[PDB]
């Protein structure tokens, strides 16, 4: 699930929240991801550790069929 | 089974029973069980989301739900 | 048994003893012990509840019961 | 043994020091290592309770004790 | 397979980052070497970061990976 | 591994170090030894911190780890 998940909303460039364990919550666009650690983008491209992560909410409905 | 998690989970989704998935943080998500894999449940409200296991503390049901 | 946790659990919930399940945020958990596998443990309550063990920190038994 | 953990808790246990177990949300536990496995230690006072090793930051002795 | 071009990139470049733990706390540095487990900040002396203990690394400009 | 040496030069140059665990909290110490498990850490006693719960070990001065 998570790859095409993650796949539907880079190639989509759906603003996304990615929400940490943290409770910080970072915003842009999923320029890329493999199984360990997902690039956002912002001003910067920052390198989120998926351990760290708890939810990944698209600002908007996108389809991952 | 070796599993419970999966039948867990599965009862959820089948039946679209409204959850609560507490986070290790405290937060407090809800909506129904759309689908899950190995490390993910993508939990369905206005959008999917997509919430990571390890970032699970508790999977509450609404109600009781039979997961045998 | 080949481990501790599996023959402590496996009391608990044979003998239906109330515990209490520690969260690693600190928030307390009760029930009973209804079944568990590698990952999960469910406590039953007023529903079942599948409790993540990555986010337990402790078990603890409301009255000693043996694990022997 | 097949980390330092193994001759470290064994010193404890053997000796039945009393020890403080840290956890990683800054609970302090206290009691002393009645036995462990793998994955948890069984953690004495007035019942055993199950503490999971992923949620304890450090084992502190309440006295100096030999590992060697 | 995208941790080693980003953060080797940030080490090349000596640029200035910030490393967001799991606790949500930031540490600044340069990125002076890491591995699997591993990145070593340097900024007054050199500190070694756990990566399950990271959750983003944050160039503090744009640089490509 | 950067791990080894950098915690080795630590141990054996008995430099006093920070461990600041995922907590936040701060511990401080003379690494005694470690595994891929562990650090223990001397002050008046030995203690064990986890790796797992640790997320930064930082050296009171500087100290070579080549």
Not at 19 to 24: D, E, K, P, R, T
Not at 25 to 31: A, D, S, V
Request: aromatic share 8%; glycine share 4%.
């Amino acid at each position: 699930l998570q790859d095409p998940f993650l796949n539907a909303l880079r190639r989509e460039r759906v603003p996304v929240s990615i929400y940490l364990v943290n409770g910080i919550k970072l915003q842009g666009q999923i320029e890329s991801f493999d199984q360990f650690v997902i690039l956002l983008k912002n001003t910067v491209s920052q390198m989120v550790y998926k351990h760290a992560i708890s939810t990944v909410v698209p600002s908007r409905p996108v389809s991952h069929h």
